[PDB]
Amino acid sequence: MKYTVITGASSGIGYETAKLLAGKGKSLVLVARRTSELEKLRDEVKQISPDSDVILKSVDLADNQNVHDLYEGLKELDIETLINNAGFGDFDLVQDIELGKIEKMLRLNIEALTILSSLFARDHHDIEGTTLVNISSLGGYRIVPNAVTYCATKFYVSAYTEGLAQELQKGGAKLRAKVLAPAATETEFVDRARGEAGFDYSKNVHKYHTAAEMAGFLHQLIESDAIVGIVDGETYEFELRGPLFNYAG
Amino acid sequence: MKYTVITGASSGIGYETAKLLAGKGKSLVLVARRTSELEKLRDEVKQISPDSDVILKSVDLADNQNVHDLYEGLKELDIETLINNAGFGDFDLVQDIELGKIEKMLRLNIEALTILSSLFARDHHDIEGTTLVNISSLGGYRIVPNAVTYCATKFYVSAYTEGLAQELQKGGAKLRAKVLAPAATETEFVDRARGEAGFDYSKNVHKYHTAAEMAGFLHQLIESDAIVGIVDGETYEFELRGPLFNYAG
């Protein structure tokens, strides 16, 4: 009846978020390219919550028109939450990057996120109980060597979302906007970012959250009054906080 | 024989930079859409410096292919400096924006700048005497109400450029990357951002630099060892300094 839209639902944080919210009886619109994985997730959602309605959207969100079309197709649904989670990364020096991939990364991590945020805001700003959650990274607040382009995309996500969140608050909007900033999380991110499958976090990363743990944090952020949900890089504690960037409003 | 590439040369900061560097006897590649204004600038550059060679590129940089084709066409030139100055803004709430314009803004402010930075770095990283200068904004370090999307584009430019600059330094590169962050500057920026010609800074803005003053700052940043050239929002003093963002390298 009321729906949560999750982009990048087919694996990782998005997948676990779907499973967690199914635990709360929510209906879901699950968006990704991998139809097969979406269908697997759907089965798992329905096992957790038989009365959850699930809508699958097999869509490449790296195309701006595809994003517009996606949103237009939801017009007959009551969306209470929209989660802009689809995204990927890259490891390489700038002088070494493949522009096809980096261009796509800009279209996905920045453009698709801006298009859906904008369209959601346009027709949810005055609707009670609505929430926009954009997924940045701790890398959207502090730069990581060998990941400059990706970090920059997340600085965009962080600044955009903090700006939007404060615009809505100050303008008396009913819509709330939030930003999740994970650190290391065990998903397919490293595999896609290095361009080779089967990275093992247990044998390569000293500190990381599971995707299930990150989904829990995401849920805590939604239910909170805080704008920012960020993992501390030193302690790996999850912190609900106010905007981190300077704001001239 | 050695060239400075200036994007957005047809008005504002870019225009004044061309005239200043002409004063230094430099040769120029001037890029923009307005052929007529490019030719006017060319006349003025030649009046300042008859021995400066001037190459004009009438190009819409909001199309990624056009940016690639632009760069490939300079292959026979010796580029010592590339300035990613083309860009525009918008004033409006997120819920009120026009997606065509904001989509274009992402393609120009973010994508064209990334493409040219990446391409320049690819074949200049080890070349003595080369400089990349990306034009951000004071709004790429502090968020301005009613300009959230644009500010996010400039947080991208700031983080990308600081990240790149540090990557190059840490890696022993000969190439130097810099970021200029103007505050209010008397250009066509307000006209294009409100979608309304004829804005008068003298009667509407308490503090602003002229485009000529900002060109001078730009020149000081190139000659400096500093990564960041930023205008103080309270004093409007120009400061040469190091990265502002948290960096983990």
Side-chain angles (χ1 to χ4, degrees), chain B residues 199-212:
Chain B
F199 177 84
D200 191 341
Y201 282 75
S202 66
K203 305 164 59 171
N204 288 291
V205 183
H206 266 191
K207 290 175 204 165
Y208 63 88
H209 288 113
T210 66

Side-chain angles (χ1 to χ4, degrees), chain B residues 112-131:
Chain B
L113 177 145
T114 298
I115 294 169
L116 291 166
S117 285
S118 292
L119 296 171
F120 195 62
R122 174 179 292 170
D123 63 2
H124 296 77
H125 60 94
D126 55 352
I127 297 180
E128 202 68 61
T130 56
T131 312

Side-chain angles (χ1 to χ4, degrees), chain B residues 138 180-184 207-209 213-214 217 220 228-241:
Chain B
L138 185 53
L180 187 72
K207 290 175 204 165
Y208 63 88
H209 288 113
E213 283 172 320
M214 194 53 53
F217 298 152
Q220 287 184 55
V228 171
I230 185 165
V231 170
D232 183 314
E234 290 290 321
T235 58
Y236 264 68
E237 294 302 310
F238 176 69
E239 301 171 48
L240 295 161
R241 48 158 297 167

Side-chain angles (χ1 to χ4, degrees), chain A residues 19 34 68 79 114 146 169 187 205 208 211 226 233:
Chain A
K19 285 166 48 187
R34 289 170 290 178
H68 282 270
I79 308 175
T114 299
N146 208 43
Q169 287 202 341
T187 69
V205 185
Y208 65 88

